[PDB]
Design a protein around this ligand. Sequence first.
Ligand code: HEM
Ligand SMILES: *[C@@H]1O[C@H](CO)[C@@H](O[C@@H]2O[C@H](CO)[C@@H](O)[C@H](O)[C@H]2NC(C)=O)[C@H](O)[C@H]1NC(C)=O
Ligand SMILES: [Ca+2]
Ligand SMILES: [Ca+2]
Length: 357
Amino acid sequence: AVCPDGTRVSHAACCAFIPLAQDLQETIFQNECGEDAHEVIRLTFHDAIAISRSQGPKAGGGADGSMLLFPTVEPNFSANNGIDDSVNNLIPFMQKHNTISAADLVQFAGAVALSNCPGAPRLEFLAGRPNKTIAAVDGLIPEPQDSVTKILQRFEDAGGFTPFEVVSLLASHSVARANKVDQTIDAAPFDSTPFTFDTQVFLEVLLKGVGFPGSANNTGEVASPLPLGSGSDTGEMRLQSDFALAHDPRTACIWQGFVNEQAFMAASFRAAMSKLAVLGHNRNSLIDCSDVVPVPKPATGQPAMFPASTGPQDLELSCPSERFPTLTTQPGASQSLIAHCPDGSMSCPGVQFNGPA
Ligand code: HEM
Ligand SMILES: *[C@@H]1O[C@H](CO)[C@@H](O[C@@H]2O[C@H](CO)[C@@H](O)[C@H](O)[C@H]2NC(C)=O)[C@H](O)[C@H]1NC(C)=O
Ligand SMILES: [Ca+2]
Ligand SMILES: [Ca+2]
């Protein structure tokens, strides 16, 4: 087909997503892998994972746009703390680009947000999900304090995800921060490069913890290897779940397998996301609109490296069957502060709309 802007697209139904991508970029992302982008990527997962094979259809419809359609229900469950901001930012687009369903909107927005992160893959995007569903039940969202067994069961019950696909999905923590785990601090990064879709998160979770970014008594949080922060540049935070998956016999070698393996990590993430994005639907009933997802920002191609103040001697390895790669260490006697803003500054508030959530 060919859209009203000369863009030759695969199917005419995909044309509507072009003006949406531009609107999302201009209004809330500003072509960067910042605050608003991170929040939308998180929403993609929270919307999709609320489904259960054992409990049946009444438990939730998966990637159905339920968070936007029933803003006063799910956003208020304990496990969805902080999701309100992304819901209120997306609702305005639902009302404007009214030919696109709330469900399609959520998945597409995530694909657009991710493309702003250097090193991220170009996600597959299928369209045609219904604009009608039910509000999901509480308890279907995994939490930081959950055990690996509980986490693995949840993903299996949601869509038959194997442990490999579960760890692959966690590559998203390479461009993630926390605002609710500790109420005394904001935007605590999970890795030293929160604006880069690289393999640092896999490396940094394997280092010995030496302190905490803020309080040391938070549910679902364990000691961090790079806790130093100053002003707006908050220190690195480490979640119990990420730590637990890095050391459990079932997932340890998978987790290590991604260290310094950029192409492998990105490809595996893309694959896992293809399954996640269609939970609650039959992919044979959705149109392929992948050619409408923006081309992702390229990375520099540099290898993973130990951040300043850490080295090979600080590793807590759990995979007995695989040799850990030889990586270099960045020079410096002390830990470098992790930048709060993608431009290096400490002042960069993302656009935020008020809404029902
Ligand atoms: C075992 C599963 C997971 C657990 C327990 C988990 C837990 C968390 C927690 C506690 C936060 C901090 C939120 C806050 O306090 O502000 C977070 C943030 C985030 N997570 Fe996960 N996560 C999981 C899986 C995933 C997956 C599969 C995705 C998406 C593909 C994802 C994407 C994100 C992103 C992008 C953020 C950052 C939000 C921001 O920077 O504002 N997570 N996650
Ligand atoms: C999907 O459902 C939503 C929720 O009912 C629809 O949203 C309304 O859209 C109109 C414009 O078309 C706005 O004036 C309303 O205010 C919206 N309602 C809310 C609560 O935001 C949306 O139009 C529907 N879209 C499709 C493609 O069916
Ligand atoms: Ca949902
Ligand atoms: Ca990163």
